[PDB]
Amino acid sequence: VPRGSHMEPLVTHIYTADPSAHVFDGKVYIYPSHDIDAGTPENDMGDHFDMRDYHVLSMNSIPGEVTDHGVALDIKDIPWAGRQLWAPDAASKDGKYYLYFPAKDKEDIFRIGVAVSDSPAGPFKPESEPIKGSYSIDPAVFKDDDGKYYMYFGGIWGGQLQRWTTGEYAGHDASKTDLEQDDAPAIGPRIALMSDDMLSFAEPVKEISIVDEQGNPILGGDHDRRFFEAAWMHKYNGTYYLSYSTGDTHYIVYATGDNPYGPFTYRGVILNPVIGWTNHHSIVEFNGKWYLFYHDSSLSGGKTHLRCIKVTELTHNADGTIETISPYIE
Ligand code: NA
Ligand code: NA
DSSP states (O other), X not given: OOBOSSSOOSOOSXXXXXXXXXXXXXXXXXXXXEEOOOOOOOOTTOTTOOOOEEEEEEESSSSBOEXXXXXXXXXXXXXXXXXXXXXXXXXXXXXXXXXXXXXXXTTSOEEEEEEEESSTTOOOEEOSSOOTTOOSSOOEEEEOTTSOEEEEEOOSGGGOGGGOTTSSOOOTTSOSSSOSOTTSBOXXXXXXXXXXXXXXXXXXXXXXXXEOTTSOBOBTTOTTTSOOEEEEEEEETTEEEEEEEOGGGOOEEEEEESSTTOOEEEEEEEEOOOSSSOOOOEEEEETTEEEEEEEESTTTTSOTTSOEEEEEEOOBOTTSOBOOBOTTTO
């Protein structure tokens, strides 16, 4: 039956989170986390998010019937992975499809790997090692209009980005949160141009600057605006939109720039806080309409680790501002 008309859950047979939406073969393909009730301890390092596989979803229209294509990748078949298959993303190039995914390696360090298929629905064959020079979580692979592909990535707290300031892991006894310098600039998300074969980075990883309207860096203590996780890139009017989750303040916010690397100037809120602690999204154009894919914990009765994905229309103004969405108003 058709789904996605009144911000209802898009699927109810499994718990779903972290929706990354793409238009491939004229259909919407969604690459979400598959939440499970693992019963692991709950904490600020995210051990309660103990996902083990990915199902790819697709829609021919919005609203529309949502197809669950089954397990596209299982952690048991990723040779380098130890635990925790967190939010994935996909890209298409030269008739191949690439699934990018964060997982903890056998030293319990988040890395980002790639898996390859001939179909947007998978299943995907993982590379035996993660991407060299990758770390942390939440990849978003963005195809720019010039044909260049960039991976945006990173997440603080349990995503470990705060432990990577020197390009080597600071250790399991390092900061559990951020730089612990609230009057210093906040940690920024990461970006790298992808190699032609889509399996590696084509440059040393860069860090993105996010500034306020006066041009000053967003500070570590500014939790309403500083980067937490879930970077996403989209373009409108030739402007680059970096949107992201603020984590402990529960917003999706956005910042605008004139090129993939930024700097990006904080503009405002995309999505106000939802039911459940986490907030994670993507923004996609389909048949000339823009959509915000997001999640909440409504289906599970408010359990933070058992989520369901939803969709709503997103409105850009011609000046490039975006109207803030509040999830439970209409
Ligand atoms: Na994302
Ligand atoms: Na606003």
